[PDB]
Design a binder for this molecule. Structure first.
Ligand SMILES: CC(C)CCC[C@@H](C)[C@H]1CC[C@H]2[C@@H]3CC=C4C[C@@H](OC(=O)CCC(=O)O)CC[C@]4(C)[C@H]3CC[C@]12C
Ligand SMILES: CC(C)CCC[C@@H](C)[C@H]1CC[C@H]2[C@@H]3CC=C4C[C@@H](OC(=O)CCC(=O)O)CC[C@]4(C)[C@H]3CC[C@]12C
Ligand SMILES: CC(C)CCC[C@@H](C)[C@H]1CC[C@H]2[C@@H]3CC=C4C[C@@H](OC(=O)CCC(=O)O)CC[C@]4(C)[C@H]3CC[C@]12C
Ligand SMILES: CC(C)CCC[C@@H](C)[C@H]1CC[C@H]2[C@@H]3CC=C4C[C@@H](OC(=O)CCC(=O)O)CC[C@]4(C)[C@H]3CC[C@]12C
Ligand SMILES: CC(C)CCC[C@@H](C)[C@H]1CC[C@H]2[C@@H]3CC=C4C[C@@H](OC(=O)CCC(=O)O)CC[C@]4(C)[C@H]3CC[C@]12C
Ligand SMILES: CC(C)CCC[C@@H](C)[C@H]1CC[C@H]2[C@@H]3CC=C4C[C@@H](OC(=O)CCC(=O)O)CC[C@]4(C)[C@H]3CC[C@]12C
Ligand SMILES: CC(C)CCC[C@@H](C)[C@H]1CC[C@H]2[C@@H]3CC=C4C[C@@H](OC(=O)CCC(=O)O)CC[C@]4(C)[C@H]3CC[C@]12C
Ligand SMILES: CC(C)CCC[C@@H](C)[C@H]1CC[C@H]2[C@@H]3CC=C4C[C@@H](OC(=O)CCC(=O)O)CC[C@]4(C)[C@H]3CC[C@]12C
Ligand SMILES: CC(C)CCC[C@@H](C)[C@H]1CC[C@H]2[C@@H]3CC=C4C[C@@H](OC(=O)CCC(=O)O)CC[C@]4(C)[C@H]3CC[C@]12C
Ligand SMILES: CC(C)CCC[C@@H](C)[C@H]1CC[C@H]2[C@@H]3CC=C4C[C@@H](OC(=O)CCC(=O)O)CC[C@]4(C)[C@H]3CC[C@]12C
Ligand SMILES: CCC1(c2ccccc2)C(=O)NCNC1=O
Lengths: 614, 309
């Protein structure tokens, strides 16, 4: 099923004839499609294409097990694949790749409507291989924490030059990106080349606001852990390593967002004249220079097809709601630069972006380890709040239509009838019963009150039923929902926060130095450098040597051997297996001891016969 | 011994710190009140600020009772969850307030009352006052000619609706859930911490003077006079050496019985019983195989010797 899809999508054939002898080149194209992204497998590298063309001790694969694992995972031979995982090397890479392969064959088989037993069992094998990765990583963390880092970040040349961090995030395997080893390593990329492991927020902000405070900060050495993408003199390196550190580039974009948001408030509370004010020109700068940055994230993303780059970008929901608000603020500008009333309406459009850009402070707030899980808590409870909104919408419009029609009989077609359905009953949920208009005094002589509309006594009574259902039934049931969905959403949103930290370090490592209002200088540097170097890759890898590659390898088979050894020891000392082994040995006692008694019967009988003959 | 270390140990107790702060502000209020106007009203204002603190302290006063004290520590532990709610609600409140003030009043001038109108109306909106006359005021019509509707003023009831839904229904109920799931943990910790702070309670009131604060100046002058005249001219039991011998022997009895009862629980837990039985049964299998081989040889030798006889 896979080989038909990768050949039909390459050169549109259709159903390939079943006699097709699927080449290792063709297997390589299956591997790239299931992996996704920029993974370009060693089969379809241009050297092995030459080798297959020139052949159909340079025939044996240097590390055969790696190719066997991929062979057994693609053909669903699970017990064979788990034996291949133990016997070998780069096992951390092998388990995380097999976790992504098993998940990728899972949704492909469900898409092709292959039988459900295929899709369930491939998702079971994905959880098995992913669980072996956590239990190997934990065992590496117990022995030597520093060598576990090198295992997590070294450049996996046999797996399209990725690292074990990138492979797990691509596999969305949340527990691997939430273990203590990965989080304290992601902290090390966050602080960058700074060793300021204390009161981190205050010292970095004082470095930004007062640039002389950078010189009093403790910086790590040049060989502690060089996480990098592609491979007076103190004081210049001190400023450069500070103003490239990802935690520095965060708070320097954050004090420019808080500086933007403080400025835009001033232009809309205070009047706007015909031409833009000095404050408003800094605002207009911030939106468009951000729009160039949001454009940059699309073009310099992972895929190659422009539409596939766009599809990667639409996945992040905070990124797409940036560009909608940027285009909305542009529309608000062009109207604002015209004569009123066009200006008045572009004033209004400006104030509606305020509804968005304070809510984007929620995402900036997500960096903190306490407010961050609180924010993802809010998003999950709103799905429960939508069901509250639908049930409330029936009860609100049932009171609203009944009140507007009984109290106001002889009305005419107007859209204000629709407003009066939703106006008064909606504010009754929030503490205002509109007490003067509950039961207005009618049909009496105060002056002379107007005559009572027929059936107006029903309006207090259906008010009573509506306020009981709204405020003591459905709001109270929403409280009961929110408690009993709070625990599991808490446990999920901590681990999802710890998993989306990886996105947060890696994007800010790729964002420019200067803030959004000054990003036009760095953006001109990138455009000029790309054009001039033409005339004349992602992630932070450790890029290790060869003799350290051997050593990091030897650390890892000892972790495979010790993991499997403690698994055999825990099984052979668990109470379940001790009762089993005791019971089976006692069963083999009973045939034995009964045989001893029958033979001692013949021995005592032969002793009696010899006693007769002696 | 050092004065700064004395100050730091004293500054560990937070109530003590806020006491010294409140006494300094009451001193400042006294000085401004014993001057003349326009300073006497300011000293009165400082006095009325200080009564808020001297009323809250009642919670520390109430912290001796077995039921109220842990409740006060519970309130203190849920303040942090409220602080997170405060930040989130502040973001939503400022969004509605800025949108309201900028849309409804479009020709204002630089003034600090803009910041008041940002925060005033949305904040009282959370506590059951929707300010019904100013939700959608009638405009753009004659009934007297009402002033023309500001452009986009229809948005204000809609962002009102969304703000009140995300204020009174979402965040408050989420804080109910947050307080409600963490109540058990905070309860257990607050009872244990209250039982711990009772030591500081007894200790401090053992060392405090007898006369009340309004008459502690007599005990304080007695203390300074006693310190001078005697310079010139915890609660322990101080047991005898015999009783030291008895409490010592009591303590080896408890240490022995502790280790012995631990070894009994280890050698009567189901885990060790199953382990020990399994090891014995393994040795039994080797030995019964040996007895089988030997007695088979013995039966064969008995048959051969019976052939001999
Ligand atoms: C780093 C983060 C935490 C804060 C960065 C933002 C502030 C430094 C900015 C944002 C809003 C700015 C204010 C916006 C508007 C004005 C009015 C402006 O006055 C006028 O335009 C008319 C009178 C005159 O010309 O002085 C004087 C500067 C001031 C106070 C600005 C001072 C600088 C402020 C506080
Ligand atoms: C780049 C932003 C996002 C963050 C950094 C904030 C500051 C660099 C900005 C924010 C507010 C700005 C101020 C806003 C308004 C004014 C008034 C302006 O006054 C005049 O031009 C007076 C004469 C005239 O009216 O033409 C002088 C610049 C100044 C102080 C600006 C200086 C630069 C400030 C402090
Ligand atoms: C003044 C009035 C108009 C109030 C404004 C109401 C809305 C415009 C805001 C208020 C709260 C916001 C929500 C707060 C929390 C979240 C979770 C967050 O989403 C995520 O983190 C993605 C994962 C997830 O949804 O759990 C950002 C979107 C969302 C739904 C926000 C969407 C926009 C909302 C509904
Ligand atoms: C069940 C709950 C969760 C949602 C249902 C409530 C909303 C859909 C309602 C309640 C208040 C309504 C608003 C109340 C008042 C107005 C003003 C109205 O504008 C005018 O009447 C023009 C100005 C004027 O004539 O005074 C336009 C509709 C609107 C925004 C209404 C739109 C629909 C709203 C937001
Ligand atoms: C399942 C639930 C969501 C149903 C809710 C339906 C009502 C909210 C809708 C459906 C039909 C609507 C009516 C359809 C037609 C008209 C005529 C319309 O008249 C005009 O616009 C004036 C015509 C002119 O003079 O040009 C005013 C709104 C009104 C009463 C509408 C008011 C709102 C109504 C009752
Ligand atoms: C289904 C849930 C999740 C969302 C709620 C959707 C509806 C209940 C809202 C969305 C759009 C609203 C409408 C948007 C605009 C108007 C025009 C508005 O017209 C006026 O106020 C005319 C001016 C006047 O004379 O007063 C009357 C309310 C109405 C129909 C609103 C009624 C309530 C609607 C249908
Ligand atoms: C009239 C207006 C100004 C309202 C006043 C509100 C606050 C001044 C009060 C109300 C409840 C008080 C809280 C109630 C409970 C506690 C626990 C208590 O803390 C402890 O006992 C732990 C600290 C220690 O004793 O070492 C005293 C602080 C605190 C947070 C209090 C701090 C002051 C608060 C917030
Ligand atoms: C849960 C969190 C988000 C609450 C945060 C709300 C506060 C930051 C706001 C809400 C109401 C505000 C107050 C509303 C009114 C006033 C009166 C104002 O006094 C004057 O303007 C003096 C002259 C006059 O009274 O007209 C000074 C600011 C103050 C205390 C405001 C200070 C800031 C407050 C306390
Ligand atoms: C980004 C979030 C977290 C905080 C947003 C804070 C705003 C509510 C503050 C910060 C900048 C403030 C402005 C900074 C400068 C001024 C000028 C100031 O003008 C004067 O003081 C002139 C003399 C006078 O009229 O008193 C009036 C307040 C105002 C508009 C401030 C109003 C309130 C603002 C917008
Ligand atoms: C964790 C939470 C509780 C922190 C909340 C901090 C801010 C939201 C508060 C604290 C101090 C407040 C300020 C204290 C005093 C004033 C002066 C006040 O000025 C006036 O009212 C001037 C007189 C007039 O009304 O014209 C306007 C609100 C403002 C800026 C307040 C706005 C809201 C502030 C910044
Ligand atoms: C506009 C907000 C922001 C930002 C700032 C801090 C954290 C996350 C995002 C920015 O200032 N420029 C780059 N991207 C962005 O959207």
């Amino acid at each position: 099923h896979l080989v038909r899809d990768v050949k039909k999508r390459e050169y549109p054939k259709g159903n390939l004839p079943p006699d097709y002898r699927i080449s290792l080149i063709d297997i390589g194209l299956v591997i790239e499609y299931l992996m996704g992204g920029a993974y370009r497998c060693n089969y379809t590298r241009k050297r092995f294409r030459t080798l297959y063309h020139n052949l159909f001790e340079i025939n044996h694969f240097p590390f055969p097990f790696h190719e066997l694992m991929v062979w057994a995972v693609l053909m669903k031979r699970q017990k064979m694949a788990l034996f291949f995982w133990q016997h070998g090397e780069e096992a951390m890479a092998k388990a995380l790749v097999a976790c992504k392969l098993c998940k990728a064959m899972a949704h492909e088989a469900s898409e092709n409507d292959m039988v459900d037993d295929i899709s369930q069992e491939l998702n079971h094998n994905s959880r098995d291989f992913g669980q072996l990765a956590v239990e190997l990583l934990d065992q590496s963390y117990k022995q030597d924490e520093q060598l576990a880092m090198k295992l997590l970040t070294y450049e996996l040349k046999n797996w399209s030059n990725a690292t074990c961090l990138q492979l797990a995030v691509a596999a969305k395997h949340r527990d691997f990106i939430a273990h203590t080893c990965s989080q304290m390593l992601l902290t090390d990329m966050w602080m960058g080349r700074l060793r300021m492991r204390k009161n981190s927020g205050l010292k970095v902000i004082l470095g930004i606001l007062l640039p002389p405070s950078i010189l009093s900060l403790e910086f790590k050495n040049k060989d502690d852990m060089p996480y990098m993408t592609q491979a007076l003199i103190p004081l210049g390196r001190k400023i450069y390593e500070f103003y490239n550190a990802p935690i520095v580039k965060f708070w320097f974009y954050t004090l420019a967002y808080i500086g933007y948001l403080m400025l835009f408030n001033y232009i809309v509370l205070v009047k706007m004249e015909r031409w833009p004010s000095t404050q408003e020109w800094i605002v207009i700068s911030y939106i468009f220079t951000l729009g160039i940055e949001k454009m940059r994230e699309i073009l310099m993303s992972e895929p190659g097809k422009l539409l596939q780059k766009v599809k990667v970008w639409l996945q992040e929901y905070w990124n797409v709601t940036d560009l909608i608000a940027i285009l909305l603020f542009s529309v608000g500008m062009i109207l604002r630069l015209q004569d009123q009333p066009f200006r008045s309406d572009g004033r209004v459009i400006y104030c509606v972006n305020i509804i968005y850009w304070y809510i984007r402070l929620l995402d900036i707030f997500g960096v903190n380890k306490y407010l961050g899980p609180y924010v993802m808590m809010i998003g999950k409870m709103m799905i429960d709040m939508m069901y509250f909104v639908i049930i409330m919408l029936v009860v609100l419009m049932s009171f609203g239509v009944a009140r507007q029609a009984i109290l106001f009989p002889n009305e005419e077609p107007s859209w204000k009838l629709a407003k009066n359905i939703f106006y008064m009953p909606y504010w009754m949920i929030y503490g205002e019963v509109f007490a003067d208009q509950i039961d207005p005094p009618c049909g009496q002589n105060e002056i002379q009150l107007p005559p009572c509309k027929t059936g107006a006594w029903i309006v207090p009574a259906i008010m009573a039923c509506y306020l009981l259902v709204a405020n003591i039934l459905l709001v109270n049931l929403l409280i009961a929902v929110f408690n009993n969905t709070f625990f599991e959403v808490k446990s999920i949103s901590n681990q999802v926060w710890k998993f989306q930290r990886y996105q947060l370090i890696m994007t800010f490592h790729e964002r420019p130095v200067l803030p959004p209002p000054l990003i036009i200088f760095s953006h001109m540097t990138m455009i000029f450098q790309h054009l001039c170097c033409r005339w004349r890759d992602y992630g932070l890898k450790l890029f290790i040597t060869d003799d350290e590659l051997k050593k990091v390898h030897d650390f890892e088979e000892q972790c495979i051997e010790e993991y499997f050894r403690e698994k055999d020891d825990r099984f052979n000392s668990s109470n379940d297996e001790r009762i089993r082994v005791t019971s089976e040995r006692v069963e083999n006692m009973s045939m034995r001891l009964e045989e001893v008694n029958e033979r001692e019967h013949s021995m005592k009988a032969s002793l009696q016969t010899v006693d007769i003959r002696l």
